[PDB]
Every structure is written in structure tokens, then in C-alpha cells.
Amino acid sequence: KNNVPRLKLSYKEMLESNNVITFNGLANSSSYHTFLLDEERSRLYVGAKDHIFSFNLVNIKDFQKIVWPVSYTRRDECKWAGKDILKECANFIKVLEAYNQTHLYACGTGAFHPICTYIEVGHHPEDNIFKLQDSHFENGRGKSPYDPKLLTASLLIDGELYSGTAADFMGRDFAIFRTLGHHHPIRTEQHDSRWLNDPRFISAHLIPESDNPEDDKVYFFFRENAIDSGKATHARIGQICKNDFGGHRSLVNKWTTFLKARLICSVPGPNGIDTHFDELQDVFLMNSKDPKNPIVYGVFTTSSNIFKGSAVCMYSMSDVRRVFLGPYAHRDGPNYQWVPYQGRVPYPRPGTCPSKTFGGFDSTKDLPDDVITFARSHPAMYNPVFPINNRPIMIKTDVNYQFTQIVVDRVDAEDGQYDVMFIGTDVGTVLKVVSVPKLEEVLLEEMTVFREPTTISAMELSTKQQQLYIGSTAGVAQLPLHRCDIYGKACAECCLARDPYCAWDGSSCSRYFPTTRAQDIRNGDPLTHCSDXXXXXXXXXXXXXXXXXXXXXXX
Amino acid sequence: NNVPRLKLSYKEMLESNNVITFNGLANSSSYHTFLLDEERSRLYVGAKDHIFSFNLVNIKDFQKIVWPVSYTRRDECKWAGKDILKECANFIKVLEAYNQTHLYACGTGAFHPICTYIEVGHHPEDNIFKLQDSHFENGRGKSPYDPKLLTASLLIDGELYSGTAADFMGRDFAIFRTLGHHHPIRTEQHDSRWLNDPRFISAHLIPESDNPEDDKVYFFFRENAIDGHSGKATHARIGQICKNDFGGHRSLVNKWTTFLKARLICSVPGPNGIDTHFDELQDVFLMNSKDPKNPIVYGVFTTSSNIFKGSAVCMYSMSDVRRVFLGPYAHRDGPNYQWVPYQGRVPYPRPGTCPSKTFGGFDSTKDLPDDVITFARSHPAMYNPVFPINNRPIMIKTDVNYQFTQIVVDRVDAEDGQYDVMFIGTDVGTVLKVVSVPLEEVLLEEMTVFREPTTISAMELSTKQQQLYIGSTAGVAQLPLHRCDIYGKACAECCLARDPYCAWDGSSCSRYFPTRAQDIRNGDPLTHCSDXXXXXXXXXXXXXXXXXXXXXXXXXX
């Protein structure tokens, strides 16, 4: 399930051949981690240390910036709090999502006093404003963490900010929060490992269930510690009802819809001891024709220090729902095994949204007390969620690096459509991989996008611009989703490359458009399609005249 | 985790007289079942349809007993469905000394296990190797029917302890005693609390006191975890029986009452506080100290995963092990309960404790009260696991594509002092020679002992002959424990080699006996010797110059 990359471009190869556009970043900043892509304006907003940037999608070297650090007073408290002056004692932006048609909402580590603000961007004729509207500063507790090292799932829909993070200086009170207008702040329970057990949040997504948008749910993806003998990590998926408002007598201003299930990403072994990849890292939804069933792509890595491994698992939303409808997890006590619950599941079912249609019940505060006391105590489901085909799409263990981030384009090619994964790496590398069905992953290329290795922290994709954007504390990098010239001048090579983007021009290898032209994504032999030492790898060499084959062609 | 200093391919070895090879009889295989007998300097080996008697000086000199099954039996086995070449024969699986003139031998009987005695002389030496015949004893519970299943076996006071499958179907695992003056005794049956589909590895009589009624038999093995819920898992285990355990009065008639088992843990602490485990036990090798009641258990372990191949060597203290077998028993009130350290009243005498004549009076296991028999009927497992000396492996091997299979350890008396030299076999037909320098493992050499890769199944060591003997289905191989010439002609190199066996002669690098100049710690030639693609591999090259630390540089050209 490993591969050898077909092509391998070092940073220098890249920059000389104009693949990368680099932002080395401001010398008084770092942590260019918090991405927000806005196609409407063609801009890539980025939250960093003491700044937010507004990058032009056409070329990130063209940008504006907002300077938004904390006061001297605050720098000083944070210092004497003990914290590291360069890495902790500043305003590290951690949250940056759209708000109304003219504003973003932004939150940052406030040198361990989290804070928020709005940022003016235009509406659609006039919209390259980047004004930092000032002296509101809202409180960032439960929105951004105090610690920059902690990450934070966040999602902002209907002017309300959902966010999973630590609520406290000490960095231990984790929770999913809703804040901002029109309703009392709601969160998960507190000091209750059944709900969340020292978790690390990764992303959150509003996924519609029906055509009625009161049925709408918010899905959080994260990882946490198992409750048992042996310390362990469980990857998790989490469910809230958009329109959940808290309970009447119990669970006042706390979720009642909260349910969570384990994500399993494991490779079946011969002994029937599977190999698990429990450390969730990025998640990326791929939108299908149905907005109620995106295809969840998830990046996972081994828990072990000794063995470095990485994995990519796909997950079906109807698979996930089955799990959230099946048996709840249960014990009669602390000294009991966890067990599928077969008592009476109170009605309406915990997990189900309030509706105006079925049940009658118009709110979460109209709920009976017995559905509230269940789910107070059965937040976890019993069944785990398994990937499509109970296997990873892809495994990477032979090698010394780990996967960090992912995005996926849906390239419309000659044979058909193909899902092209771009995977970031804790060594500053991107893998471009094609899922060609029968699946076969074909590792097209492995590119180095930073002068020096750093972990890639963020990756976003612009189909309009055909570009890929990358984050790290070192800076931001820009990539074309394809440069088809890079393969051969000859036909043979452009066909062999197996690149959904790249078809044979006639004259020389270039972008493929619908409706002359001759690529082969399956199989990829130049013979039946092109009608005419060290190469780039995956070809074996023979001296007789050097040769290269694995179709064949001399050198 | 290391790079081997030297690496000898099979050819290098055979050309330089390191290996003596037995490619084995063409109508045989599975040269797996070793019995070393220093007294009459011979290495007995149980194979497919034969037992061999190899001369320890040179295994090319040998005798053999031909002991296959009848036509009748070949024929049943065939029609039982079994593979004619790999299953339908007498694969010897057990071969231990019996009295001063006899061995006891047992084999897969083409899925009808059988045993026999083998005459060897009184001491003399008279080299008898007579197969005493037509008395064939029943091999059930002694050898398995399946050749692929392994079997711990130990024979002391004319009684054969053995852990294996008792049945054709290969599922009824148990520790057995047979050949008694006493009724046959075994573990319980169909009870995963006791043994849960285990794979036995070796068994050892380890004295507790000076009174040899306190003697215990320790089995080393692995098995499946019991959960309660799913994650399938392997636990490495150590197991305890009382030599003189005879069964219970009313209950556990002719079954062990002394049986207790504990988990062996061999794990590397991780930064997140998720340790990395090596649960698959493979070989075990006791190293005898001045105290025969505390040998140092060396154990070879590998990962359970298919995807990630890893291997590990963990040492274990016998006083560590005993603490565990005296501590809390494992317990549940039911199937849906967590396992829990037992804090009820532990009936007396303690389950696990041997019958003695000294204290209490109680002269047997059948004199035991019924309440100590009903406990231990149900608490055969201990709660605490056993951790290695320093909660770490001695050595880890994960970067590489092979796994460890077998081990032995010599205690080389060197100039600086004593050093424990591990020889480790490999599922690729390779031996690693490793030195534990005090902590630091130094991978002296990595040798290939079979023309083609096969798993090493057996490894035995002869200090008298200074030789190492290896097993596989392909055959048997012989190694000198040292060939000191192999390093440099110069002093520098022989010192650098860090080999307990090898000191600098004066004239040229040779064996060390109690003018010499070795350095095992550190190993720098400067303070000890007062005189391109390098030969070494832990040396770096600045072009061709050569420099390794332990820094020590010298101009290679």
C-alpha cells in the first residue's frame, strides 16, 4: 500500500521551474497556520502571530496585512506568568471565519488572554477592504485557546461561532462552544471524561440531514484519550444539532444533542490483530452532488513513537449516521465493561433534532427530563465508524515522515473523473496522489515547498485559480495544481504520468479540457495511446544504449 | 537500534571457514528440535523421520536414527487430508535426557503422536545411538499432531512436563506431566482463563530455596488476551507450577493447583505516555548466575503488527517475577466486569505455594482445604504484569525488514571485565552478535549462515567447544563463537572491534585468555594501541580517509 513517488522535485527544482511562489513571512511573526479561503473575493486570509494577512489568490506575493498585537500591559503580564516571550506572549490568531457579507470574525491567543474582533472586508462590488475595526475587543474565552500550541476546530454559521478548544489558562477544560448572537452561550459538560476526555480538535462542519434546515447538524472531528488497560487514542466524530438550545431543568445551557463515535482507521492483519492509525490530523470533505453526504477524507498517523506511519481513510456519511442511530455505550459502574445499551431508549431519541413537523416538540427545553438524563450519561455511541472498505486508501510506513494535512480536487479527465489528493507532510512536502479505480493509488509526484523542512500546518485549494496554498510557522507557499510541462516533451512521458490534469496536446503536454488529445489514467501505457543515468523513478534501467521500462523506451 | 559493524554474507563465511553446514538428508527437513549434551560431546537433533547425533567438534561427523511411521499410518494421515511432505511424517518435537543411559523422544506421528526411548551410553564415551524399538508409547500431550505447533518441554526426575496441543484438531492446549510414578496431570480444559490459545516456548526448573520440594517449573509462552469487547491482542506470559504438585482432593482431580500465570511486558515508553509493545514472545534463554535461584531471563520479542516489523530483547529478574506471583491475583465478579486486583481474603495456604514438610505440616496438594482449591480454579492469572529490568528493552530492531527468532548468551571473561555477548538468530537466516557494554549494545557483526534465507528455529551454544549451532528446516549450521583474524591485521582494528573474545596478540589479533590490549568500553585504539568503501560500517569517510568514535580517526587512502 506504500509507493515510490514517480517524480521528486526538491525545493530548488521547484523555484527554478516557477512551481512555487513563496512568502518567507514577516521577521516579527510566524505561525502562518490559520487559513480562510474566500473565492468570492479572490483572497486567502491567514491568521498568524500578531497579524492577519490577506493574500491575493492569483499570487500571494501581493497582499495586505492587519497588525493586531496585544498591549504592553498584556505582554508584561504574560511574561511574568512565566510564558515564552516569542512563542507564547503574543496574539497568535487561532480562528478566522466569515461573519456577515461584509465582515470576518477573528480570535487569537491574547498572550494568554484570548480576544476577538471583527474585520471589515467589502461586499461584492467593493470588496478588498481589510480594515481592522477597533476597540470592541470581544472576549476570546472558549473561541481561541490561550496556548498557541493547542489547535481549535471552528465553524461560523448563522452569525454564531461553534468552536472546540480549551476554555482556560491552564489548557485543560476542553469543550465545544457556541457563542455570538441571539442565544445564551452553550457548551459541552465540564470535567466529564465521558463527554470529552482531553481531546484535540481538528475541524467542524455543518452537514444537512434533510431538506428542512432545522434538521441541520454540526459535525466535529477530533481525537482524545480512551477510557479503558493501556493509554490509548481514539479518533472521534461528534454530533450537535444546529438548533439545540439546552435543557429545561437539567443541562441548562449545555448541549443535549451531543453524541460521539469512534473513527477507526486500521489495516486488517493476518493474525486478526489489525494495525491502527488512531491519531487524527486533517479532515477534508469532498462535496458530491448530494450536500447531505460529502465524502470525508481523513489523515491519520500511528500513536507510537518507535514506528512512524500514516494513513488516509475515507468515510461515508450514511455509515456515520448508522452508528449514531445504533446502540449507545453503557456501564452500570466504573468497574464494568462498556456494553451496548439494550434498555429503553427514551423518546424522542437523544441525538435527534427538534422539529416543527414530527414529534410536536418545538425545542430542546420542551424535552422530557428522562431524555435529558440519558445522554447526560450516554454521550458516546458503542459502535465505531469504519472507513469505506474497512481499509485505508493509502498507507505510508516505510518512510521517516508523517502525514499532516490534505485536500482533494475532483479532476474531470478523458477516461472520467479522478480524485487527486494533495497531502502535506511534517517535512514540508506535498504528495500528489491519484485514486484510479478498478483502488490503485499512484504517487505522481513528491514536491518540496519550503527551502527548509517544517511541518505543513495548513493546506487550501482554489479551483477557480487552479492553485494550492500551504501553511507553516515559516511562511506560506503557492502551487499550481498542475504544471504539465514538467513531464516529457515527448508524448510517451505525458501519457505515462497518469495525471488527470495533463493530457497530450499534439504539440506538447498541457492542461486537459472537455470535450488532438490522448491521456491514459488507468493503466497508462503510451503504446495504445501515443501513436508515434537516472530518469525520474519507477522505471528500471538496462545497459546492452541505456534503457527504461516497467511500457518500455530506450535512452 | 544499530548499524552492524561487520557484515558477512554466506559466501564470505564459507570461504573463510566460519560456517560448517549440514544441508541435511534429502528425505527430511525441520531440523528444529535440539538437545545439547556437553558430557558426551554431541548435539542431538530431532527432525522429520530421523534424530541426528552430531559431533560437537564438527557437525559433518554424525550418526542418525531412522524413525518414521508405518505405511498404514502414512495412509490414514493422507486421507485425513494432510499435506504429504509437511504433515504426513514423524516430525520429532521433543527430545530430552531421561536416565543416565537414555533419551526420551516424541514426534508428530503423521497426526498420531508417539514416543520412544533412545539408548546412549552410560557416559563412557561409548557412543551408542540405538533406537530401542516396538514399544512405542503414546505421544498425546507430549508432542503435537501438527508439526507447525511448537512445544515447551522439560524432563526432570524421569517425568516429562510439556506445553502443547493434546488433540488432532490442534486446539486443546495444556501443560502436561507424564511418565510419572504418578497419575498424569494437566491444566484445565476449555477454560481461557487458564490458557487461551497459547503458543509455548520453553520451560525451566528453577529452585526457590535449598529445599528441593520448593522447586517450581516455569513455562514461558504467549496467548490471546481476554477482554470482557474487542481489540484482539497478544500477551506474553510466564507460568508457574510446583514440581511436586499432585492435584486436588475433591476438585481439580489430576489437574494443577499450583498453576499461576503473569504477563510479561516488553515495551518502550513513548513521549505521549503510549508505550510501544513487543508482545509476541519468541525464544527465552536463561543465563546462569552464581545463584541458581535467580537466572537472568533473556527474552526475544516482536511486534504483533504485520505492517510494522519490529523486534526486541528484554531481560527479566526472577525476584521481579516472584514479587508478581505473590501480589494481587486477577479478578472479576462476572463476564461484564473489568479485571480488578483481588482484595478479598486470599485463602491459606496461598495458592501458588508448594507443599512442604517444614511449615504447617500439610504434606500434599490433596491435603489442601477446598477453599484454596476453588480459588485458583478461577484465579489462575495474576493482576500485576512483569516488567523488564529497567522497564526497557536492552535492544530494539525496527528500522529493518527482518525479525528476531532466537537467542543465546555467552558470558565472556575479558580484560576490562565480564561481558554478556548475545547471538541472535533471525527469520532471514542471520545471526547478530551484540555486546552489552555497561546499557550500550554494540552490534559487532551480522552473519548469514544459510545459502538461502530461512527462519532460524534453534540455537544452542557450547562453551567447551567455543561453538554455536543453528537450526531450520533447511539444515544445521556451525559457528565458532569468535574468529579474531577477521578484524584487521593491525592493532587499531582489533581494538576497535569491541569484541570480548578478541584481544590484540602483539603479533596479530587472536583469542583473549586471563601483553594484551583490548578496549571493550569506549574502544579507542589511541590509549590502547601504542603503535574506497571502508571495511567497517560504523566508520565515516572524508575522501578516502576513515573515522569512527566508540573520536578515533586514521588515513585509509
Ligand SMILES: *[C@@H]1O[C@H](CO)[C@@H](O[C@@H]2O[C@H](CO)[C@@H](O[C@@H]3O[C@H](CO)[C@@H](O)[C@H](O[C@H]4O[C@H](CO)[C@@H](O)[C@H](O)[C@@H]4O)[C@@H]3O)[C@H](O)[C@H]2NC(C)=O)[C@H](O)[C@H]1NC(C)=O
Ligand atoms: C532417508 O534417506 C536415507 C537415504 O539417503 C536412508 O538412510 C539409509 O538407511 C538405511 C536403514 O535405515 C541404512 O541401512 C544401513 O546400511 C549399512 C551399510 O553401511 C548396513 O550396515 C545396515 O543395513 C541393514 O540394516 C539392518 C541392520 O540392523 C538390517 O536389518 C538390514 O538387513 C540392512 O541390510 C544399516 O542399517 C543405510 O545405510 C542408510 N544410509 C544412507 C547413507 O542413506 C534413510 O533410511 C531414509 N529414511 C527414511 C526412508 O525414513
Ligand SMILES: *[C@@H]1O[C@H](CO)[C@@H](O[C@@H]2O[C@H](CO)[C@@H](O[C@@H]3O[C@H](CO[C@H]4O[C@H](CO)[C@@H](O)[C@H](O)[C@@H]4O)[C@@H](O)[C@H](O)[C@@H]3O)[C@H](O)[C@H]2NC(C)=O)[C@H](O)[C@H]1NC(C)=O
Ligand atoms: C511587524 O513588522 C512590520 C514591519 O515589517 C510592521 O509594519 C508596520 O506597521 C505599522 C503600524 O502597524 C505601519 O504604520 C502605518 O504607516 C502607514 C504609512 O504608509 C505606508 O503604506 C504601506 C502599506 O501599504 C507601507 O508598506 C509603506 O511603508 C508606507 O509608508 C500608514 O498607512 C498608517 O498610518 C500606519 O500607521 C507601517 O506601514 C508598517 N510598515 C511596514 C514596512 O511593514 C508591524 O507593525 C510590525 N508589528 C508589530 C511590531 O507588532
Ligand SMILES: *[C@@H]1O[C@H](CO)[C@@H](O[C@@H]2O[C@H](CO)[C@@H](O)[C@H](O)[C@H]2NC(C)=O)[C@H](O)[C@H]1NC(C)=O
Ligand atoms: C533407563 O530407562 C530405560 C527405559 O525405561 C530402561 O530400559 C529398560 O529397562 C527395563 C527395566 O526397567 C528392562 O526390562 C530392559 O532392560 C530395558 N528395555 C528397554 C526396551 O529399554 C533402562 O534399563 C534404564 N537405564 C538406567 C536406569 O540406567
Ligand SMILES: *[C@@H]1O[C@H](CO)[C@@H](O)[C@H](O)[C@H]1NC(C)=O
Ligand atoms: C457586520 O457586523 C458588524 C458588527 O459586528 C456591523 O458593524 C456591520 O454593520 C455588520 N453588517 C451587516 C449586518 O450587514
Ligand SMILES: [Ca+2]
Ligand atoms: Ca474554516
Ligand SMILES: [Ca+2]
Ligand atoms: Ca486542513
Ligand SMILES: [Ca+2]
Ligand atoms: Ca532438507
Ligand SMILES: [Ca+2]
Ligand atoms: Ca531441551
Ligand SMILES: [Ca+2]
Ligand atoms: Ca532456543
